[PDB]
Symmetry: C3
């Protein structure tokens, strides 16, 4: 059983519809009032990819597989899983690849939200937004995706 | 010469054709009998991205460049390269981004296959599958891609 | 304030135009004379994603947000930021996902360029090129993208 330092990378992608001129997206727990997310879940690519990076770091079955609204249940889950396995989080670096919304505007709020739900300091979190040159599925605003990269550090 | 902890990220993408109604894919050493992979190589995005994450972690020339069927030759290669450089693998986290096949169904078999070819425990491996909302090249089943993230830990 | 080992992942994407038969791209500080990059910046996905992986590792505001030609100003910035925070770089692994140009041909020059601008050894750098099966925005040569993965190691 390996108990050294662990890497995780979560990935998520959700279909969206921008309320331009011809269910509301939540991103890092922040409501995005001009974008709908077309999903059975709440569409929070940031929360879901963070859960997936934790699960991945530790080698668990993923969320859908484990449990066959929901985003907070899973994040609390992931936090308590790191605890029971005797790890702390080192830092997490999140890349949201999204033509809309702009992330810089809501970045402080996402970071505080993550830090509360993971119970870690704001200095252990980075959330960055990248547009996609208005090319492809993302750049045409049909979808948004997120990569979350995390290190877990063995306690003591 | 740096001998501390090392990060690697491998990436791979292969063209596929799903045998719907109008050479066989291998994924993590598992044959996928309803999908053809259109490739000169065996199309194993999982094996190839794992090799590339190891090579990347250590700063080698990549597979094609190094050696200008094949997937086992390269994986044995990568395992023995980690050995000769005096590293062990920490853990590896693999994200297959594929509309088909579903990964959860074959996940145990891929993990055992990786653990045998890398000679590491099953607890050091995570393999996760993500669909792509039926959007773009991946979501339309024209291709499958994989990201493999690894840490190498200096021996002793 | 967390001062253990840190992970960063930078991502960047730029629009390009290949000078086929019907401003010049710089990649890892190397000029690519058959490709134009359609950008307000110099289009160096490799330099920019490296800066973003450093900023991400450390939890800074990103480049555009921090400072609202340019690629060297930012890289020197990132190097001196790692210094002032009391970190060294472990290693960096870069995946350029580009149908053109081929990276293997210019890989030595990019690695020497990175190692000079970051002031680290060539053994701490890996730069890998992956084509995209001539599918999608990348495979059709409309864009090139890069992922840069880095570990920062607390001094002493
Ligand atoms: Zn999701
Ligand atoms: Zn995508
Ligand atoms: Zn391959
Ligand atoms: Zn792709
Ligand atoms: Zn850029
Ligand atoms: Zn892309």
């Amino acid at each position: 059983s390996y108990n050294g330092i662990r890497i995780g990378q979560g990935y998520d992608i959700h279909k969206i519809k921008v309320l331009d001129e011809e269910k509301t997206l939540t991103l890092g727990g922040v409501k995005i009032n001009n974008v709908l997310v077309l999903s059975h879940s709440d569409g929070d690519i940031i929360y879901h990819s963070i859960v997936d990076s934790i699960l991945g770091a530790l080698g668990s079955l993923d969320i859908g597989t484990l449990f066959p609204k929901n985003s907070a249940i899973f994040l609390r889950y992931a936090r308590l899983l790191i605890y029971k396995k005797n790890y702390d989080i080192g830092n997490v670096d999140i890349n949201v690849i999204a033509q809309v919304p702009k992330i810089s505007n809501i970045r402080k709020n996402i970071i505080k939200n993550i830090s509360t739900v993971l119970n870690i300091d704001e200095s252990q979190i980075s959330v960055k937004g990248k547009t996609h040159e208005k090319l492809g599925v993302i750049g045409e605003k049909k979808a948004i995706e997120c990569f979350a990269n995390i290190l877990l550090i063995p306690k003591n």
